[PDB]
């Protein structure tokens, strides 16, 4: 996102606002035809593509509402302050710094990092249903779970990964007990 | 394996009536071993199992998206109201004697993955199989009756 500093409020905010978003789900929910697609955000100067070299030069914000307006649960993680004036960008959403593999872990922000790394490797040999057309491919060594189940603790990302239509496991009623030694 | 690097295997299978059970009559699918937790830090594996329990009660889908405000306390009270112990724990009954269990059990659903590494692919034994060409040694290779 592109912070904007000279703004009607007399301080910084985002060039993106509600109407923009409104037409989005509007265009999303065609599915008349105006197609307020991602591209439009660009040529409207809404969000700016940014690379590594460029980052050296800027000062980004974690979450907009978190930070941009100048200004509680004990169970909440403790969050940093908005002292920083000259923000020029705000992150789209930080949970978008994870690979395909990571954003299938529930709550990857509560575990111990190598666990994730272990998890990252593991799904890639979790069996599941790799591709719906499967009945007609003549591949070798394809493995298909029977009654795949969409998980419970999903993750706002994973929808995009269409996991919830080709899931790779089952919810199971597990009990953490020292039952019989075995 | 869980979704957190708890790759484990199947110790053993117990048909249902041996599985320890709760008052409600549920019996766990699958039992793991508390010593799995402590030095794996696999806290998220707990909270999922909690949240996943709440979801299957209410009907929603637990949002396990990471950097979200959704604390434990928030999940907890939500669980309580549905009529379960706040921390997902339950009374459970041993399945052999049909007795109470002098301590209470963690309990919920939780997403599990299966993995390629089935045993029937990993077993073989060899007593005077076929030798190599070169050093007349027993051949290698499991599919090939290796040594």
């Amino acid at each position: 996102f592109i912070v904007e500093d000279d703004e009607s409020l007399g301080h910084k905010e985002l060039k993106v606002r509600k109407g923009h978003i409104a037409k989005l789900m509007a265009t999303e929910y065609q599915d008349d035809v105006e197609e307020y697609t991602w591209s439009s955000l660009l040529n409207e100067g809404l969000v700016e593509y940014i690379d590594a070299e460029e980052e050296e030069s800027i000062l980004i914000a974690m979450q907009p509402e978190d930070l941009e307006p100048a200004e509680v649960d004990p169970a909440k993680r403790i969050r940093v302050s908005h002292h920083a004036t000259t923000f020029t960008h705000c992150e789209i959403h930080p949970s978008m710094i994870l690979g395909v593999a990571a954003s299938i872990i529930p709550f990857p922000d509560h575990n111990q990092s190598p666990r994730n790394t272990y998890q990252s490797a593991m799904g890639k040999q979790a069996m599941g249903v790799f591709l719906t057309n499967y009945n007609v491919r003549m591949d070798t060594m394809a493995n298909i779970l029977y009654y795949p189940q969409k998980p419970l603790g999903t993750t706002r990302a994973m929808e995009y990964l269409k996991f919830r239509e080709l899931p790779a496991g089952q919810n199971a009623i597990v009990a953490i007990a020292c039952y019989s030694g075995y | 394996a869980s979704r957190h690097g708890q790759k484990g295997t199947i110790g053993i299978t117990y048909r249902r009536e041996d599985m320890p059970f709760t008052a409600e009559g549920i019996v766990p699918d699958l039992i793991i071993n508390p010593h799995a937790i402590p030095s794996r830090m696999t806290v998220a594996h707990l909270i999922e199992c909690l949240l996943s329990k709440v979801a299957a009660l209410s009907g929603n889908e637990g949002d396990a998206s990471p950097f979200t405000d959704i604390t434990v306390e928030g999940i907890s009270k939500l669980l309580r109201e549905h009529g379960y112990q706040s921390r997902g724990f339950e009374v459970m009954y041993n399945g052999h004697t049909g007795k109470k269990l002098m301590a209470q059990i963690f309990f919920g659903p939780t997403y599990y993955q299966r993995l390629r590494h089935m045993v029937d692919d990993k077993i073989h034994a060899r007593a005077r199989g076929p030798m190599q060409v070169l050093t007349r040694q027993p051949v290698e290779g499991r599919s090939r009756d290796g040594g």
């Binding site: 789900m25 999303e28 929910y29 706002r156 | 929603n60 949002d63 959704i70 928030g74 999940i75």
Partner: peptide, 15 residues
């Protein structure tokens, strides 16, 4: 604390 989708019902109505 959940996942909600049909707000197309809202959004097409809110529109």
């Amino acid at each position: 604390f959940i996942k909600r989708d049909r707000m197309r019902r809202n959004f097409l109505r809110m529109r």
